[PDB]
Design an enzyme around this catalytic site. Structure first.
Site, short mmCIF file in Angstrom:
data_model
loop_
_atom_site.label_atom_id
_atom_site.label_comp_id
_atom_site.label_asym_id
_atom_site.label_seq_id
_atom_site.Cartn_x
_atom_site.Cartn_y
_atom_site.Cartn_z
N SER A 147 0.79 -1.23 0.00
CA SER A 147 0.00 0.00 0.00
C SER A 147 0.82 1.27 0.00
O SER A 147 0.22 2.35 -0.05
CB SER A 147 -0.98 0.03 1.17
OG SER A 147 -2.08 -0.82 0.90
N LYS A 193 3.20 6.60 4.79
CA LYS A 193 2.24 5.67 4.22
C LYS A 193 2.78 4.26 4.44
O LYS A 193 3.86 3.93 3.96
CB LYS A 193 2.00 5.90 2.74
CG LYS A 193 0.98 4.91 2.16
CD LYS A 193 -0.43 5.16 2.71
CE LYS A 193 -1.34 3.97 2.48
NZ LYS A 193 -1.18 2.98 3.59
N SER A 194 2.01 3.46 5.16
CA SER A 194 2.36 2.10 5.51
C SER A 194 1.97 1.13 4.39
O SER A 194 1.15 1.43 3.52
CB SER A 194 1.60 1.71 6.78
OG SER A 194 0.22 2.02 6.63
N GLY A 195 2.56 -0.05 4.44
CA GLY A 195 2.17 -1.11 3.53
C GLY A 195 2.38 -2.45 4.20
O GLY A 195 3.23 -2.59 5.09
N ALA A 196 1.59 -3.43 3.78
CA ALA A 196 1.71 -4.80 4.27
C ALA A 196 1.25 -5.74 3.17
O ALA A 196 0.29 -5.44 2.46
CB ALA A 196 0.85 -5.04 5.53
N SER A 201 -5.71 3.53 4.13
CA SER A 201 -5.26 2.43 3.28
C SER A 201 -6.42 1.65 2.67
O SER A 201 -6.27 0.48 2.32
CB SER A 201 -4.26 1.51 3.97
OG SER A 201 -3.29 1.11 3.04
N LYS A 208 0.00 4.08 -2.52
CA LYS A 208 -1.15 4.97 -2.45
C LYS A 208 -0.73 6.42 -2.24
O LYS A 208 -1.37 7.33 -2.76
CB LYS A 208 -2.12 4.51 -1.36
CG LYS A 208 -2.83 3.22 -1.71
CD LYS A 208 -3.52 2.56 -0.51
CE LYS A 208 -4.22 1.27 -0.97
NZ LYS A 208 -4.46 0.31 0.14
N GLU A 230 -5.40 -3.72 -6.30
CA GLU A 230 -5.66 -4.36 -5.01
C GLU A 230 -6.72 -5.44 -5.20
O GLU A 230 -7.69 -5.25 -5.94
CB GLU A 230 -6.19 -3.32 -4.02
CG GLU A 230 -5.22 -2.23 -3.65
CD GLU A 230 -4.16 -2.72 -2.68
OE1 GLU A 230 -4.17 -3.94 -2.36
OE2 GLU A 230 -3.32 -1.90 -2.25
#
Ligand SMILES: [Cl-]
Length: 259
Positions: free
Chosen positions: A43, A205-208, A101, A46, A137
């Site tokens: 993510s 901005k995080s992502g996983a 997210s 984004k 996504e």
């Protein structure tokens, strides 16, 4: 180079692969570790896709009402799932993608910039030859090691984030909109924000993703200093691997000490 031992020790303590690139925008000093290795960006795109959206569209055009269907809702759409019948303003969708997210918001953002192909085309035009964007996504989180779809490097991502948030990719008014969208979001609380001193401010901005992929990218403001741009990416050998937010926070502490 001095930090390589610290980062390698974190890889062992968290049984993970770590990719780091940070640049002090006031001095051009960089911290790098595996900064040219590919990871699934998950993510974190984004924030950059929101930057592309802002570059390609006026502030007023963010008022356009975008609609979608129940069928369009992919996993983890906490904002967009509340507004199926009515639609949402484009700016609110972009904000939901960056702040929460929301995955359907991420797909609408993709749609508005020409899909994954359009996102990649925009990055190539900014000089990014590295990022590969292929899927929406949530398939883009598959993160198969060796599969370059939906991957980039810490250096490439950080360089793009710098262009949008401090550089000349956006006019100042839109740069402010983007950096504000990145500030104050709970999805970032345990990552870079957890690893900086209490007088620093973080817009992230995080992502996983699969293969234990766990990422955070950020513009960070120390007191009385020019911003620092950080990308921290991580992944693991096993498809169903867990992740540990503390790895990202610990990596951030190494960057802070070095910068
Ligand atoms: Cl490398």
């Amino acid at each position: 180079q001095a930090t390589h031992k610290e980062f390698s020790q974190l890889e062992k303590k968290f049984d993970a692969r770590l990719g780091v690139y940070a640049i002090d925008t006031g001095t051009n000093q960089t911290i790098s570790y595996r900064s040219n290795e590919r990871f699934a960006f998950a993510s974190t795109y984004k924030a950059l896709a929101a930057g592309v959206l802002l570059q390609q569209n006026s502030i007023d055009s963010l008022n356009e009402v975008i609609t979608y269907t129940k069928e369009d809702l992919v996993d983890y759409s906490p904002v967009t799932e509340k507004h199926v019948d009515t639609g949402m303003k484009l700016g609110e969708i972009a904000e939901a993608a960056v702040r929460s997210s929301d995955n359907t918001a991420g797909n609408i953002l993709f749609n508005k910039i020409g899909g994954p192909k359009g996102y990649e085309k925009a990055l190539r035009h900014m000089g990014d030859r590295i990022t590969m964007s292929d899927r929406f996504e949530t398939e883009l989180n598959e993160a198969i090691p060796g599969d370059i779809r939906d991957t980039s490097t810490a250096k490439a991502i950080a360089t793009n984030l710098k262009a949008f948030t401090v550089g000349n990719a956006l006019p100042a008014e839109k740069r402010k909109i983007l950096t504000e969208w990145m500030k104050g979001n709970a999805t970032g609380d345990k990552l870079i924000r957890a690893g900086v001193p209490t007088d620093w401010v973080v817009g992230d901005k995080s992502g996983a993703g699969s293969y234990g992929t766990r990422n955070d990218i950020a513009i960070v403001w120390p007191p009385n200093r020019t911003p620092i741009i950080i990308a921290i990416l991580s992944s693991k050998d096993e498809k169903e691997a867990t992740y540990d937010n503390q790895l990202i926070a610990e990596a951030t502490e190494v960057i802070v000490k070095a910068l």
